[PDB]
């Protein structure tokens, strides 16, 4: 199907405990492939997936230099935003940024993203036109005027339509045996009695990649949305993900319930029931 590349920047101040820490991680779809940590004994952009290891010295040196520059730029930016909100020098604050591109099955740009947050709240976002800005408040308006004056959107657009798309296509080819392989969920249904009156049916999915999945319970063919305990999809540690959905049913009505599973690894969607 379609694919994404994203970089996630976290910049965190810590007054009294040194200068602010800057972390960058890069992903293709749900696969992390690089990291940088300004707290590391020797800070550098480092591989976190096997298919990136073949990149040469120019790549690692460029990505390391930009990240080290970013460490300084984000430190100044944290000082700036503290001023914009009249905040004390004693508190710890966070700038987060995520940017990247989505491409379709033919590798064509579907859209680009660049969004920032400050202490967990929307701060400023590049619009889908990759030309204009949305500032969340009068503090972010100061950033917006700085960035318009510097023609930042034009630089972000060049990257999002240029390098981001080109390198994503390159990564997808170098890592095709994993990045372009969908592993279907292994599924099963369990039955845990609660009382003489009801029991829990839990519908499991294990070992799937990527993380996107749809698990739903129906009773007499009707989705039990309000009645389904959905757990957050979770990583197994081997690149794959796990998920379950649970519904509480009256004893003896178990056969009126079906679990439905949609995942791009699956030849066709799955319908499951409890098999005692």
């Amino acid at each position: 199907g379609s694919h994404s590349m994203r970089y996630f920047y976290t910049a965190m101040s810590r007054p009294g405990r040194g200068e602010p820490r800057f972390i960058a991680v890069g992903y293709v779809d749900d696969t992390q492939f690089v990291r940088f940590d300004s707290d590391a004994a020797s800070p550098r952009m480092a591989p976190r997936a096997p298919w990136i290891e073949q990149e040469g010295p120019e790549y690692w040196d460029r990505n390391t230099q930009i990240s080290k520059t970013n460490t300084q730029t984000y430190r100044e930016s944290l000082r700036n935003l503290r001023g914009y909100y009249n905040q004390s020098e004693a508190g710890s604050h966070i700038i987060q940024r995520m940017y990247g591109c989505d491409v379709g099955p033919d590798g064509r740009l579907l859209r680009g993203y660049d969004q920032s947050a400050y202490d967990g709240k929307d701060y400023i976002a590049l619009n889908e036109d990759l030309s204009s800005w949305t500032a969340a408040d009068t503090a972010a308006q100061i950033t917006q005027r700085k960035w318009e004056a510097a023609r930042e959107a034009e630089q972000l657009r060049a990257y999002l339509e240029g390098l981001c798309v080109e390198w994503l296509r390159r990564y997808l080819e170098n890592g095709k045996e994993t990045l372009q392989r969908a592993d279907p969920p292994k599924t099963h249904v369990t039955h845990h009695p609660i009382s003489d009156h009801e029991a829990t049916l839990r519908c499991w999915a294990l070992g799937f990649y990527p993380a996107e999945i749809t698990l739903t319970w129906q009773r007499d063919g009707e989705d039990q949305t309000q009645d389904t305990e959905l757990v957050e999809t979770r990583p197994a540690g081997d690149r794959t993900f796990q998920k379950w959905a649970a519904v509480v049913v009256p004893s003896g009505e178990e056969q009126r319930y079906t679990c439905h599973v949609q995942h791009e690894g699956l030849p066709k969607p799955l319908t499951l029931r409890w098999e005692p």
């Binding site: 970089y7 960058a24 990240s67 700036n80 510097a150």
Partner: peptide
């Protein structure tokens, strides 16, 4: 690959 280092906020 990462985007070139941009302007401070």
């Amino acid at each position: 690959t990462v985007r070139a280092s941009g302007h401070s906020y």
